[PDB]
Structure 1
């Protein structure tokens, strides 16, 4: 399975790039590990945008 979940991790990258999401490789790994727990992703979509707003609040 360890063969399969590296290749599915690589194909998972392209559809996150072409859908124009804010994710790069690192944040993609954080988010795939976070969804693996069982969290609803429609909730995660708001906390990522609130972090990216309040990050710009400092600078």
Structure 2
């Protein structure tokens, strides 16, 4: 029952809704595993912002695809 890790994550997602972060629990869960394996949270933030624009603007995702292929 040291699996009260579920509660700590519950409170983080409440703070995330309060701050209007636009993270569901599942995306926050992914972030938590990444940061605890040593990903920098600022870099993670920047990656998430960029992923959001990629999904919103086809031109920028295609620009990514073309750099990735070259």
- TM surpasses 0.5: yes
User: 1:33: Cα distance to partner?
Assistant: 1.0
Partner residue of 2:33?
A: 33
Q: Name the count of aligned residue pairs.
A: 57
The residue aligned with 1:48 is 48
Task: Determine the C-alpha separation between the residues in 2 that align with 1:6 and 1:54.
Answer: 31
RMSD, aligned α-carbons = 1.0
Q: Deviations over 1:3-51 (max 9, x none)?
A: x211111111100110111211110111111111011101111111111
List alignment gaps of at least 5 residues for structure 2.
59-70
| 4+ residue runs over 6 A deviation | none
Counterpart residue number, 1:8: 8
- Unpaired runs of at least 5, structure 1: none
TM-score by length of structure 2 reads 0.73
